[PDB]
């Protein structure tokens, strides 16, 4: 019905911390996935885009929190965290700490401390109206082999081969004088496959006479010995 | 001239054969309200000696009588009784409100609503498999969305 795409950059050693049923320092006080996450953990390395030879004050990790975060909780507040018996109404004291800290991603750091971009696709499985259109069917084209074809509604059986029919740039059906629906243009691509009959003919049984013998031979009129003894 | 009649999903077909049937006494049994002889004619049923005379009986609603026709679709025409396109016979129907209607309602006549497919001509199914209307497996218990087909 609706997939929620949530993108965020994390450290290089916490790629597996964001998983169903995992107690991590960036998985409990931050974006948490529940035990019923029906999505994916698609992620990749970004040591080329998010890397910069500087202090890297772009990202943080939000460790200092008063309580555990609910799943899919986005806390935008910047209040001063209080550990205990030390209220800080002004600036953060010795016991009070800021809920943000620079995430230094140095380019010389190896695997484990590199910037990784992780995006989880929250697949909602609520019984509701699905896609406005519906699953598009798609099958690879087979060439020289009789296949029943239904392209954009041009239903018919035949061998779909490669054609030198440079179609004027706007047509699709392609018929003949005897009104046979020959060449058809690929609905998807701009290829033109001319159709042919599905190798039909006539069976003729040569018999020298039942009085003489019983060995007979069959003649398939109009067959190149490819569509099915000497 | 019977009193006990099954529902529409049941037929109780009695094969009348091996005996010389006369179609002239059926007009004196009870006043009928519908006489649809497809393929045959009511006037010439006497001289015609057919091989097998199948006789089924079932109770149906008044608004559902028009669905009993060769090559007809409907709720009681595709899931309860499918007549073939080459049907050669008569259709006898008559109202029985004076015998099958009690003041508190009679719930002894059952009809099948909808299946995964349509019934073929001349088929009878008495299976009571509870229908599954949804995506959740129903373990043979009538619940919220697991409705009985009858």
């Amino acid at each position, epitope marked *: 019905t609706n997939v929620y795409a949530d993108s965020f950059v994390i450290r290089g050693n916490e790629v597996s911390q964001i998983a169903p049923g995992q107690t991590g320092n960036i998985a409990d006080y931050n974006y948490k996935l529940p*035990d019923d996450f029906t999505g994916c953990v698609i992620a990749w390395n970004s040591n080329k885009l998010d890397s910069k030879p500087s202090g890297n004050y772009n990202y943080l990790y939000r460790l200092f929190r008063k309580s555990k975060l*609910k799943p*899919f909780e986005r806390d935008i507040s910047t209040e001063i965290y209080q550990a205990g018996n030390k209220p800080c109404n002004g600036v953060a004291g010795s016991n009070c700490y800021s809920p943000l800290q620079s995430y230094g991603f140095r380019p010389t750091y190896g695997v484990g401390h590199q910037p990784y971009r992780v995006v989880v696709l929250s697949f*909602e499985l609520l*019984h*509701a*109206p699905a896609t406005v259109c519906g699953p598009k069917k798609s099958t690879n084209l087979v060439k020289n082999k009789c296949v029943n074809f239904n392209f954009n509604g041009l239903t018919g059986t035949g061998v779909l081969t490669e054609s030198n029919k440079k179609f004027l740039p706007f047509q699709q059906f392609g018929r003949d004088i005897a009104d046979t629906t020959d060449a058809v243009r690929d609905p998807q691509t701009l290829e033109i496959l001319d159709i042919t009959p599905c190798s039909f003919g006539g069976v003729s049984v040569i018999t020298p006479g039942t009085n003489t013998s019983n060995q007979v031979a069959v003649l398939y009129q109009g067959v190149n010995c490819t569509e099915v003894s000497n | 001239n019977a009193t006990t009649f099954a529902s529409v999903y049941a037929w109780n077909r009695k094969r009348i054969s091996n005996c010389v049937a006369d179609y002239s006494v059926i007009y004196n049994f009870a006043p009928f309200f519908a006489f649809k002889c497809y393929g045959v004619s009511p006037t010439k049923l006497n001289d015609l000696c057919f091989t097998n005379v199948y006789a089924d009986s079932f109770v149906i609603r008044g608004n559902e009588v028009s669905q009993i026709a060769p090559g007809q679709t409907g709720n009681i025409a595709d899931y309860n009784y499918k007549l073939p396109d080459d049907f050669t016979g008569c259709v006898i129907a008559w109202n029985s409100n004076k015998l099958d209607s009690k003041p508190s309602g009679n719930y002894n006549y059952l009809y099948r609503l909808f299946r995964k497919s349509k019934l073929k001509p001349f088929e009878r199914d008495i299976s009571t498999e509870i229908y599954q209307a949804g995506n*959740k497996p129903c373990n043979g218990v009538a619940g*919220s*969305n697991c409705y009985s087909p009858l």
Partner: antibody
Amino acid sequence: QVQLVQSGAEVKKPGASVKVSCKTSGYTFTDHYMYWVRQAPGQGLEWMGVINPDAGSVTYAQKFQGRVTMTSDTSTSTVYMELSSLRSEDTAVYYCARDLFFIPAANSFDYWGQGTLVTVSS
Amino acid sequence: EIVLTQSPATLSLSPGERATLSCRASQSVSSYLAWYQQKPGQAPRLLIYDATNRATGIPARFSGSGSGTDFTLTISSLEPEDFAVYYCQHRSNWPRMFTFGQGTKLEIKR
């Protein structure tokens, strides 16, 4: 403080539709799901059903499955529930319940409303 | 569907003792269960969710536990404001099929 206000009393007739609203307050009506539960006199909770505050992606119960329409509205942050063809067994007290999780997941019901005594008779 | 059934359905005890109300099921609902509390004249409140942790705004006397297909609530000390009806609900993941049971009334022993 989050307080879900609902309607009051509502009488109906067999074969009709009752419109009952349950306005939200305190929290942003974009992140938390809502459920509509029925409490019958003497019985317990019967039907589930969730309404998405963002879009019309809702999920009705299995007993009704077609005779209830739960719409959404981000203008006044108020949900709606219109049960059609009320019978002599639908007379109960309808409640609106929120969820302790966010849009994707749903664990249970935490914030409830006040109820709406709907009856079907003269 | 998962027919949540409660065997006692009537827990007559005295204020001060401990209570154990059971609500079993068939499918594995070890991590999929919620506990409510419906007082007469108001709306049901959340008692214990996820069947393993404590909810918000709940006193320390309410302690829930259980795993597999057998669950029970372990109340520390009964109070006059605790006598009410409790229910149970499991949370199916793929199909939205939140069902309930029948309810257990807590009486006062005299």
